[PDB]
Amino acid sequence: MEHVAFGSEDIENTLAKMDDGQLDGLAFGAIQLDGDGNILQYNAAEGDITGRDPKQVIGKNFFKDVAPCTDSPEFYGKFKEGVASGNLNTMFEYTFDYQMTPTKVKVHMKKALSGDSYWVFVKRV
Ligand SMILES: *C(=O)/C=C\c1ccc(O)cc1
């Protein structure tokens, strides 16, 4: 080793976020999902690295293989009424870390406009 390595994650989410490069999208963030809860962030506007996968979360259900905090059906009972209604629009909590570099975000989910889905921003706090 010397100055050529990495790990897995060292930010807060992915491409659609606060500020680190910024790209075409919304004005908050997004991870996007599908019917069962499969991440869709993999075909709309790639980040910026050019070498391999966008991240690794691809194909992994945000349900229990990406988020080491969501320990329930999905969010907190806000994806069974917002999905059936056809106008998801709810906020609560979700965090992102609790041992490395903690935080105190406030999540703002909605029935996506970037490509038909049920995203989960993170908001600016
Ligand atoms: C997600 O992490 C939600 C809650 C929670 C509560 C206590 C501790 O220690 C970690 C996480």
Which atom of ligand 1 approaches the CA of 68 most closely?
2
Nearest CA owner, ligand 1 atom 3: 69
Contacts of 5 (CB under 8 A, 6+ apart): none
Residue 25 structure tokens: 């999208």
Experimental method: NMR
> What's the number of domains the chain is made of?
1
Which residues are CB-neighbours of 71 under 8 A, at least 6 positions away? none
> Which atom of ligand 1 sits closest to the CA of residue 70?
1
Report the CATH number at residue 81.
3.30.450.20
92 lines ligand 1 (CB under 6 A): no
| Burial profile 43-54: b = 16 or more Cβ within 10 angstroms, e = fewer | ebeeeeeeeeeb
